[PDB]
Amino acid sequence: SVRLSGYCGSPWRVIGYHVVVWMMAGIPLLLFRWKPLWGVRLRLRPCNLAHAETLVIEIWQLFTVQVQTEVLRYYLFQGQRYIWIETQQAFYQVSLLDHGRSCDDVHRSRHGLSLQDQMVRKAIYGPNVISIPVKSYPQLLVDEALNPYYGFQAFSIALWLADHYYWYALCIFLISSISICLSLYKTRKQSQTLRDMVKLSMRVCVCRPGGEEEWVDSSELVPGDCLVLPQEGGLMPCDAALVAGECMVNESSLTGESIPVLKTALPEGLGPYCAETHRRHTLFCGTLILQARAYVGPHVLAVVTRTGFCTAKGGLVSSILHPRPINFKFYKHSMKFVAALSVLALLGTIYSIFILYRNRVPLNEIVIRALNLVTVVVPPALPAAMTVCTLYAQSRLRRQGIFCIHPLRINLGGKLQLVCFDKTGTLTEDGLDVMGVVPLKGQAFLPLVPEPRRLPVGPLLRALATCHALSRLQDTPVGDPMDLKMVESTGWVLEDSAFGTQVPVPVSVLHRFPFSSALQRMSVVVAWPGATQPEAYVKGSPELVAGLCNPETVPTDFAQMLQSYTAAGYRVVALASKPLPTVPSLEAAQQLTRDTVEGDLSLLGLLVMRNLLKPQTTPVIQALRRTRIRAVMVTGDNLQTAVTVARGCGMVAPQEHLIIVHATHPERGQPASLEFLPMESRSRHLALSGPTFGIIVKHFPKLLPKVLVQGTVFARMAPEQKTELVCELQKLQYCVGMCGDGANDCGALKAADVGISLSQAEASVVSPFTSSMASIECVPMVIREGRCSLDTSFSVFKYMALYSLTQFISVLILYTINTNLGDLQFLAINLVITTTVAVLMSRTGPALVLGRVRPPGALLSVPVLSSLLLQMVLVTGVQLGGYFLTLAQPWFVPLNRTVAAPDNLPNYENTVVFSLSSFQYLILAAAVSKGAPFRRPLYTNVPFLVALALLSSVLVGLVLVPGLLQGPLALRNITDTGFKLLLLGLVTLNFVGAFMLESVLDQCLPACLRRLRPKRASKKRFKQLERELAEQPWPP
């Protein structure tokens, strides 16, 4: 959904808008920064998009994008480049400008681009640079410091100086500057981090037609251009397709996969070159080329396909620079809650005006004092407190090993209700493991031998340790992980190729037949000293190998045994051998045909390779299921293995039923039909594959919501089907986490509300959340931190409300008695007592254990609002009681009403109110700070506990110790001590009452509101579906 509206240039209109906004007032600027579409409409006039010199983009977020000329008319929106293709009268993204061309076209491009034809491609595509723009500190200030909040704070600073409250004005300015500097630091540091993370400048050779080789910078590369990759291998500057040769690529830079991966030349064909399909023929930007071998030609060649932000790493960086808006609204009914507090403040302000008039204070002072009171209820430290809360959450995660690039995504961990787990690498170990070999003695399967090392030397062990296509790179074999683990299990050392006995003669590979996907098997020619004839070893699927094997050698239990193995999640391959009467020699063996070796084989044994469940997986899954979080397996693997793992890891506990949803494709003459196949070992789970998921999404849209609500295993899911599933689940108002670790989970991790990658490093761009640890234990950690962050932010906002209302009430009372709180008494209460205690309260770590109860999401809920209105009742009661109680004393002398504050100060009324309110701020900071269920107790926060104790001691000294800070703060000295003790008793009464009020609310109001009003329904579509199912199960 993209809306474009061209605005052709108009000088007179532009200058008219200029003067109007610059002269009239700042209100138009405020409403333009709120609603800038009218600003552009008045500043420039609509035009035919073929003539636009400025665009307005809506994705209903609105951006304005000028249009550059290079004749090429193009614009840049969020890094991507859109060009004006004059013929079709539309701005087409350059990403698609050459989309869909055939692999044959890519191969034909292997002669490169003529320098004359390279300028056009450069102008279209632009430089091959993922340019992170640098904003100057002045411009960072202007961006941060021009908010409406800081504008109001500057207004307040001006007012407090109008009334001569210089210390409080300095306090506001310092708090606001500290607020602005945190934002500037983090925003500038992140930009400088990305700028160097995407930094790359090589001198890459290219193949300019005519036969000459041209050396150019890394930024002069354009799609279709041809690269000459060095034999030694270095970083990859562009996102090229490998046309000739092969090269080891360490793709950890892009996807975090630590192991080298083989890239093979692109195959000639008429299909479209797809980076996701032909991902074994594509070289990505930022990955490292370890070796590059040119089997034909003097050097290896790749064809540039994507450059700049078009590259995969470019898209990953763009998703960090331009994140999609976070799904949850933190301020649920922002205007309504702020309006409740604002109507309270408005009633107070009108009361203040009425009483100031009744006190016969001049009108200018009336207006100034009313505006000061209105400013009291906008705490200068609110943005600082919120940002600091997010920073603390991020730091705690980073110390746990979890790295979130966007700290505001952390609160989405405490909103999670469903987590999708990739099976392999995330739930189960990275690669397969060998639990044994099943040799034969004639036509009978021998008992499984757990480890193949002790197998007596023979054709089976030689096949195990030799029948493979490994290549020793840097003394570390590389290739298919299955072969790696098989040969490692044999224990033999790879030194064509020879293998030495671990403890018994070395064995040589006379000839090797490379594996093929269509052949489902591979064969080799193997000889060893003392061997009369070479032995050719063949490994392949059980049925196919058995078919070529001699029938009298295959036991009748072959099919039954392999099916029994498959049922238990094992993957099985068969090993066969045949003696070749050919003389043992390198040259003679090389002429043997693949058909000769593959045919007339002997079944020697069956090899079973199991992918194991990580030790930390089952506890985490069971903890999530105990918290009533949905654990879903979204894998691209078989359904048998997926269901076996799901049962094993506790997604399907032994008592639940598992039903297979199978959707038949609507073959000729019949429509699509669902059939359900129950299994015998959230009480009903569904398991369905990728084909079934697609058929249900297309043909069965009525039944998709139920499948998604009660589906558990999603096997054989294509990488786009994972993203489709995540989006479909989010359509049900789920908050979906995706703990996929692999590279193919990229779209799912980007779509998911919380996307986590398991085995990553510090500076990873793969997904919003990346952890350094292999196990899925980082998912409970993220959920616990998210719940802690939600509770902490709710408590900080509650404190900034309680704070603000307490100061408002104190100022109202002092206006009533016709004095004010005092300049340095404002400075203390705000700079020290409240800013310290608000930035320190958000330092309390998450509770160590997940619980079934979830944090709220509504700041306007009855709990929060009742807590505020009953804390404020006790605050006002305590202050009023202390005031009315200092009148009854004998030594009391009413303040001089004729003069106005600060001329009244010091006086007993202001002193009493200041003391009580100063204690009340600390009392409220401690009261709003909760421990369990979501946070650790208050006392585990040593800085916060120490701040509370130190400030309480200082305030007790102010109340008791005479002459301590009574000059600066302008406090009146009370000679009496019984009154001081009574004041401390009243403060202790408020402390006890506030904690008792919080406890009583937390314990009773939930039950009270549940009994008082039963839920009409659950707003969540998935909860409605869960009810509709519990009343009547869908699969009957």
Swiss-Prot record:
Protein's membrane topology: Multi-pass membrane protein
Ways its activity is controlled: Accumulates in an inactive autophosphorylated state. The presence of spermine results in a dose-dependent reduction in autophosphorylation.
Lineage, highest ranks first: Eukaryota, Metazoa, Chordata, Craniata, Vertebrata
Superkingdom, natural source: Eukaryota
Protein function: ATPase which acts as a lysosomal polyamine exporter with high affinity for spermine. Also stimulates cellular uptake of polyamines and protects against polyamine toxicity. Plays a role in intracellular cation homeostasis and the maintenance of neuronal integrity. Contributes to cellular zinc homeostasis. Confers cellular protection against Mn(2+) and Zn(2+) toxicity and mitochondrial stress. Required for proper lysosomal and mitochondrial maintenance. Regulates the autophagy-lysosome pathway through the control of SYT11 expression at both transcriptional and post-translational levels.
Listed EC numbers: 7.6.2.-
Disease annotated for this entry: Kufor-Rakeb syndrome: A rare form of autosomal recessive juvenile or early-onset, levodopa-responsive parkinsonism. In addition to typical parkinsonian signs, clinical manifestations of Kufor-Rakeb syndrome include behavioral problems, facial tremor, pyramidal tract dysfunction, supranuclear gaze palsy, and dementia. Spastic paraplegia 78, autosomal recessive: A form of spastic paraplegia, a neurodegenerative disorder characterized by a slow, gradual, progressive weakness and spasticity of the lower limbs. Rate of progression and the severity of symptoms are quite variable. Initial symptoms may include difficulty with balance, weakness and stiffness in the legs, muscle spasms, and dragging the toes when walking. In some forms of the disorder, bladder symptoms (such as incontinence) may appear, or the weakness and stiffness may spread to other parts of the body.
Protein name: Polyamine-transporting ATPase 13A2
Active site: 422
Subunit structure as annotated in this protein's UniProt entry: Interacts with MYCBP2; the interaction inhibits the ubiquitination of TSC2 by MYCBP2. Interacts with HDAC6; the interaction results in recruitment of HDAC6 to lysosomes to promote CTTN deacetylation.
Any GO molecular function: ATPase-coupled monoatomic cation transmembrane transporter activity
A GO-annotated cellular component: transport vesicle
Organism: Homo sapiens (Human)
